[PDB]
């Protein structure tokens, strides 16, 4: 879908492991999607296995992390997500897209155009998207402010 | 060992999390048995001071509010009735017993018994006072507690004010419980379950008539929630449907697996060296799919969920299946684009290829699905008749025992249908396929063949369906209305051809406690229903019949939703709670609760004029008028009637802030009255009198508009107040302007305050009404349906 | 789709600053109208082209 009247963002979202919206919200909207499911389910070892993942999510909200200097030891509030998981890749997919979802509707109070494709892929993600007429500079310009 | 720390002020993001429950875990009710009378008046010794305005040696009770509280503003006042209101709702009882609460007066002569703590109380300080006459402690001595044994009934001594007396009456003479027999156990279960000779009953106890038990309230939907809430309705329907999946049984002993499709393979003649669409016909003929369909298509058709497809076309089974499915579940069960899909594909390759013809030329949206266009088209009795019927399965909806219910056709249940879908197949096996070659033929009729070859079978697992789904059925409260849902259910055809071809003569029927259970939860989700509905319609046309027209009706309806314990309150819209809202209005109250507001009408104004902290208004009379005469006050400048002069409302000056009238009016000098609750200060002078201060308050008015720093002076006057003499010796009776309008208190009278307050004596209150009876089913082969027929039986 | 029970009218205050802003921009340009309408004239009744 490139063409003279569509333009494309693309983003690095590398460093976006300590921000703020990796912690509580990110893990809480886990656990509230859980919640939800347990009430949709009738058996046991389901429930006992998502009341697991969820206490997970509980303990990783906060997480202190050993890292030497020297001889003795720091240990610091790092209520946030990285890599070493099994979850890591998916939700930081399932995050970023929800992320861009929610900034992309925000463009809309100023311009009109028809979003085409999301793509997330760890380290990097791109939307395109389409417009009611032709591309310009200041068009550019100001949607990337 | 040596360690280090830092730290990090994280924010706290907090949702509102809509805290939710499921039906089973929906906790029935907890019964109020009552505490203490309830009261809001009590006595109290005042002074008194006779004419002329000095003192006696003498005092007299009087009635005084309990606690106080009344606001400032006609508005907050009518907020305090409402909150009163709720107290009570909050404080009415369901059933209680006087003996529980009574005790023992120390002055009877017969050694008698009274109904509660403060009536008591009363009776001994009024006893022991110095100056009561002997004929209130004769009373007192009388008065004790008679009991009839053979009618179970109690008679006790109360003394309470007539207020009092009206609300508590109230909860004696409609207390909601009801006499308990082992008939009315019976009858609580339904009548199908009774009339199935497929359970058998009994129980090992007695009750007596002193048993009791509370009636739910299975109402019916005032609200039409399918009528236009459509996201209510999709959480309610997923809500049951879970609920109903719990209640299906699971299959019993299932043909082996790897027999039957060893069987499978001889039968279909594969080979090594082809692909073979054959082939696919062995995909996911798993068991726990079985169960999985039997399942879904149960607990849809209770819950009234609608219920999508999915299948590969590369699968010519799951089309050969689908026809079996089609048939006996109806086709506004389903949604529409996927079943049109199926019957597009079932044409397209089992019967215009057969009978010679066109593929087909089919629109998207076309308004008729394909089986009704094929109906016509084709030339042949057997397969034309079969469409017939499956274009025209619906469900019939019956009023039952107050339940609505989807029933079927009577022809399904009794599997006849599965006659007419096989002789369709087997005119099918004879066609030729004139365009199409022989192998395609060939995979066909042999598909086709493996159903033909369980005649039997699916005639016993049409029934048994029919069966269980009326028997699940037959434990709701709630009516079950077809109406589709936002949202479906998956349902794959390869757990129909699973169903369908590991199944045989081993019959699953739904245990009497599944079914206990069921109804029990069903009905409690309904009377909650009920009751918060009750509940709200009370509380809003409370508050239209106040005109509490600040209020605003969000958070009543926030909390009907959170109380029923399935909804995402946190995320339902506010234009969807005030629908709500308008439909709620326009609903009937229960009597309890528009009795017990009826009184509260008639009797606010009542409690109000009471209170000594606040006056209903007060007068201005630029005119020296009289004091007035009083026995626990003394000259006291007191207003009552209020007529002659005009009178100003202030909660409508508040409202509209227009100080033009009461300014020009106030400059001027002209009488007038200021209506509107009021505090005030007690001036127990007399120089504060001649040099007349209670006009000095009003200047202010002027200056500063804001009539709420506003108190009127309440000139009391007795031989308590160190300048009595002037009124003692110089013979003036007292004079004074800008009267206060008020009331007095009312006295006390120990003689017709008593009342006798009459009960039972000594029953017992039963909840889980089903704990009482044990159940059992026939052995399951020797089972038998509607018709008066073995059903399974078929080999 | 987002609005409900609240109104929300004009303060007093921006009413009179909205009132005298209107005011102040109608006043000023009727007089520089008259300013400029009377140096023409003069410009033109004293010959000067």
Known sequence: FLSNNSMVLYTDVSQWDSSQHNTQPFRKGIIMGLDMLANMTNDARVIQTLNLYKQTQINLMDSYVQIPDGNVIKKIQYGAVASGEKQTKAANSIANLALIKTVLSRISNKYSFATKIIRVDGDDNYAVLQFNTEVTKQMVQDVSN | ?795
């Open chain 2, 1 to 795: 060992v040596q360690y280090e720390i830092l730290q990090k002020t994280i924010p706290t993001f907090e949702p509102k999390e809509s805290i939710l429950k499921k039906l089973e875990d929906i906790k029935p009710e907890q019964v109020k048995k009552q505490t203490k009378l309830f009261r809001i008046f009590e006595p109290r010794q005042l002074p008194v001071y006779r004419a002329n305005g000095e003192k006696e040696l003498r005092n007299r009770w009087y009635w005084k509010l309990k606690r106080d509280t009344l606001p400032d503003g006609d508005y907050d006042v009518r907020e305090y009735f409402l909150n009163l209101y709720d107290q009570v709702l909050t404080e009415m009882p369901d059933y209680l017993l006087l003996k529980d609460m009574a005790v023992e007066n120390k002055n009877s002569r017969d050694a008698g018994k009274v109904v509660d703590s403060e009536t008591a109380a009363i009776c001994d300080a009024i006893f022991q006072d110095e100056e009561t006459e002997g004929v209130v402690r004769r009373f007192i001595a009388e008065m004790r507690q008679r009991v009839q044994a053979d009618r179970n009934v109690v008679n006790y001594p109360s003394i309470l004010h007539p207020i009092d007396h009206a609300f508590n009456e109230y909860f004696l003479q409609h207390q909601l419980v009801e006499p308990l027999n082992n008939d009315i156990i019976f009858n609580y279960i339904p009548e199908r379950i009774r009339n199935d000779v497929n359970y058998i009953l009994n129980m090992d106890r007695n009750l007596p008539s002193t048993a009791r038990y509370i009636r739910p309230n299975l109402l019916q939907d005032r609200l039409n929630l399918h009528d236009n809430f459509e996201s209510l309705w999709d959480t309610i329907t997923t809500s049951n449907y879970i609920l109903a999946r719990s209640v299906v049984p699971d299959l019993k002993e299932l043909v082996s697996t790897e027999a039957q499709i060893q069987k499978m393979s001889q039968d279909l003649q594969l080979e090594a060296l082809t692909i073979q669409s054959e082939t696919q016909f062995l995909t996911g003929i798993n068991s726990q799919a079985a169960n999985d369909c039997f399942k879904t298509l149960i607990a849809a058709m209770l819950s009234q969920r609608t219920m999508s497809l999915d299948f590969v076309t590369t699968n010519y089974m799951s089309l050969i299946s689908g026809m079996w499915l089609l048939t006996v579940v109806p086709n506004d069960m389903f949604i529409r684009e996927s079943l049109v899909a199926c019957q597009l594909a079932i044409i397209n390759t089992i019967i215009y290829p057969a009978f010679g013809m066109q593929r087909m030329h089919y629109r998207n949206g076309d308004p008729q699905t394909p089986f009704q266009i094929a109906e016509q088209q084709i030339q042949n009795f057997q397969v034309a008749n079969w469409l017939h019927f499956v274009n025209n399965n619906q469900f019939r909806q019956v009023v039952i025992d107050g339940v609505l219910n989807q029933v079927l056709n009577d022809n399904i249940r009794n599997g006849h249908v599965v006659n007419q879908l096989m002789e369709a197949l087997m005119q099918l096996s004879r066609q030729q396929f004139p365009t199409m070659p022989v192998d395609y033929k060939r995979s066909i009729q042999r598909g086709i063949l493996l159903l033909s070859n369980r005649l039997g079978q699916l005639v016993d697992l049409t029934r048994l369906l029919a069966y269980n789904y009326e028997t699940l059925m037959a434990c709701i409260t709630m009516n079950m209305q077809h109406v589709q849902t936002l949202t479906t259910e998956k349902l794959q055809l390869t757990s129909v051809t699973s169903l369908c071809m590991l199944i045989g003569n081993a019959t699953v029927i739904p245990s009497p406690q599944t079914l206990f259970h069921y109804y029990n939860v069903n009905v409690n989700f309904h009377s909650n229903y009920n009751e918060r509905i009750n509940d709200a319609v009370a509380i809003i046309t409370a508050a239209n019949r106040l005109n509490l027209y600040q209020k605003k009706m969000k958070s009543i309806v926030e909390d009907f939703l959170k109380r029923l314990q399935i909804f995402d309150i946190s995320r339902v819209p506010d234009d969807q709670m005030y629908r709500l809202r308008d439909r709620l209005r326009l609903l009937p109250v229960e009597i309890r609760r528009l009795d017990i507001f009826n009184l509260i009408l008639m009797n606010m104004e009542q409690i109000e004029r009471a209170s000594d902290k606040i006056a209903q208004g007060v007068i201005i009379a630029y005119r020296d008028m009289q004091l007035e005469r009083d026995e626990m006050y003394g000259y006291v400048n007191i207003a009552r009637n209020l007529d002659g002069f005009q009178q100003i409302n202030l909660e409508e000056l508040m409202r509209t802030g227009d100080y033009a009238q009461i300014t020009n009016m106030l400059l001027n000098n002209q009488p007038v009255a200021l209506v509107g609750a009021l505090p005030f200060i007690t001036d127990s002078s007399v120089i504060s009198l001649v040099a007349k201060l209670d006009a000095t308050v009003f200047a202010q008015i002027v200056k500063l508009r804001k009539v709420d720093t506003l108190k009127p002076i309440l000139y009391k006057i007795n031989s308590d107040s160190n300048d009595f003499y002037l009124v003692a010796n110089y013979d003036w009776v007292p004079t004074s302007t800008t009267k206060v309008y008020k009331q007095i208190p009312q006295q006390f009278d120990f003689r017709a305050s008593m009342h006798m307050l009459t009960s039972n004596l000594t029953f017992t209150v039963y909840s889980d009404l089903l704990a009482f009876v044990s159940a059992d089913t026939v052995e399951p082969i020797n089972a038998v349906a509607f018709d008066n027929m073995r059903i399974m039986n078929e080999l």
